[PDB]
């Protein structure tokens, strides 16, 4: 019964530098990721994400970016921007790191390791190949015509503080903050229907 | 001029399962870590930490725990509890992982890797050997008579959302939440004065 937004809305929102929320399907016990495109990371957007999520910020990336950066060739890998930051943990610093990761001119030496941002390598083919939030993030940036790099983190429950938000609460959060809530099931369906 | 709390207060608070805040010294531009003892991790305490910090939760550990667990022998290392959790990211899940890390009966196989908690290896000798927040955390648990394992994360600025809180704001946060704010400088001084 939970209302779900459309893939068209999600894609336009991502293109506009907005965030969306992504869950697996209509199951009422799904956790959900706040997702935006990494090139659209600003201090304000990352602050919002850190405020409402676990803070364990990840950056899904196309394999080609990973390979370009000498990361995650086909222990957890972490990175910070080498330049333009302080300690690497602030919303403004992680936003810089995220934009750098999405920047096709960046190279391996533009990052210090270890760091405070967690890159993840998306499977080629996106959600049609692996129905993960990692793949959903990259697919959405690609569909919005952006560089194939996203930023993801899971939304904390405000009702049950020990927990992560489930589908009904995620619906409320999305409505309150003017955001789209979509499922990977629907994104798969859309991608199948439109080549 | 910023009022600082005493090492005696910090240690009693840690013993009582409370959190404290630790900065380097009286410099007004220091960032500060919220710190509690890992065995004192509860869903409520980790929820508080996640709410007000970067969410990039770390667990300073004595070398002996690290060695016992096959972690960080003398890429970033991450762990989750194998048992008793869901996805590993909730406040309740990370609290379980933290308690397990502090539990002297746990072994390597009690953890799955990778995970969502970041262990850090404290230098033997604590802040007298390396004046880090990692060392401060372990020293405080030891001084409180607890297992040498802590939980740390940096407090986000509520005044300037892109930033981390500095000394004056940290003073306000500590006062508002009934917490001690101490410096590593004073902890070093205390430890030197009392063998
Ligand atoms: K937070
Ligand atoms: K948070």
UniProtKB/Swiss-Prot annotation, chains A, B:
Job of this protein: Catalyzes the conversion of D-ribulose 5-phosphate to formate and 3,4-dihydroxy-2-butanone 4-phosphate.
Lineage summary: Bacteria, Bacillati, Actinomycetota, Actinomycetes, Mycobacteriales
Chain positions of site Essential for DHBP synthase activity: 116, 154
Residues given in the record as D-ribulose 5-phosphate binding sites: 28-29, 33, 130-134, 154
Family designation: In the N-terminal section; belongs to the DHBP synthase family. In the C-terminal section; belongs to the GTP cyclohydrolase II family.
Organism field: Mycobacterium tuberculosis (strain ATCC 25177 / H37Ra)
Annotated spans, DHBP synthase: 1-193
Protein name: Riboflavin biosynthesis protein RibBA
Domain of life: Bacteria
Gene name per UniProt: ribBA
Positions contributing to Mg(2+) 1 binding: 29
Positions annotated to bind Mg(2+) 2: 29, 133
Complete-protein stretch covered: 1 to 206 of 425
